[PDB]
Amino acid sequence: MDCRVSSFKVKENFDKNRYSGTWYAMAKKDPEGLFLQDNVVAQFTVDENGQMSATAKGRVRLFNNWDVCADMIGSFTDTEDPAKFKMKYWGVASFLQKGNDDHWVVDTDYDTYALHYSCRELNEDGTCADSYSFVFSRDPKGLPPEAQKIVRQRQIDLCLDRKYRVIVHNGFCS
């Protein structure tokens, strides 16, 4: 049971165009502090020069109770690893958070599911101190019993097992 971040294995030869399109977040594992809550849908596209970007809608509560529908946007720069990106994000609205997080795709089938992960804070022993993860599906209705078994194994080998929470979509942002 090695939970060092550098130990985690990511998607072999990640194909940036097979991955583009609409993805629906079905479950998540939260990080410390302020973060997207529900009704979150992401849209990936890749330009002619291979650059990948994405926009995202989601409900987020602020200060104290203030649900707003955050329109986020991120760009991705490539690393020595096809699956491991650096993502710069920001919102159409200014008060919304800007920032830079790693963006790694641990696993995907590009036809039905994608499993994302990001460690914002590394510990002294290499394991992650503060992290979040997303489980996306191409189908707004969710994964098959059989794709769910793959997903739950991924969560365990990430040491995030039993820490995910089902995301719901009730047109709060449509």
Ligand X SMILES: CC1=C(/C=C/C(C)=C/C=C/C(C)=C/CO)C(C)(C)CCC1
| Structure-block tokens of residue 36 | 């997207």
The response to whether 153 counts as a known ligand-binding position is no
DSSP H or E stretch at residue 145: helix 145-156
Question: Which stretch, 1-9, 52-60, 107-115, 156-164, contacts ligand X (CB under 6 A)?
Answer: 52-60
Torsion sign across C-alpha atoms 54, 83, 20, 27: negative
Going by C-alpha positions, the residue among 1, 2, 5 that lies closest to residue 131 is: 5
Provide the mask over 66-95, with x wherever binding to ligand X is found by CB under 6 A and - wherever it is not: ----x-x-x--------------x------
DSSP H or E stretch at residue 137: strand 128-137
Number of CB atoms found within 10 A of residue 65's CB:
6
Is 151 a residue that touches ligand X (CB under 6 A)? no
Cβ closer to ligand X: 42 or 143? 42
Site for ligand X in 107-136 (CB under 6 A): 134
Cβ closer to ligand X: 2 or 78? 78
Is 159 a residue that touches ligand X (CB under 6 A)? no
Q: Least Å distance between CB 16 and ligand X? A: 13
**Which one-letter amino acid corresponds to residue 137?**
S
Q: Which of 27, 54, 114, 151 binds ligand X (CB under 6 A)?
A: 54
CA 96 distance to own-chain centroid: 18
**Cα–Cα distance for residue pair 25/40, rounded to 1 Å:** 6
Longest dimension (CA), the chain: 44
Q: Least Å distance between CB 157 and ligand X? A: 20
Q: Least Å distance between CB 2 and ligand X? A: 25
Binding site for ligand X (CB under 6 A): 34-36, 42, 54, 56, 60, 70, 72, 74, 89, 96-97, 134
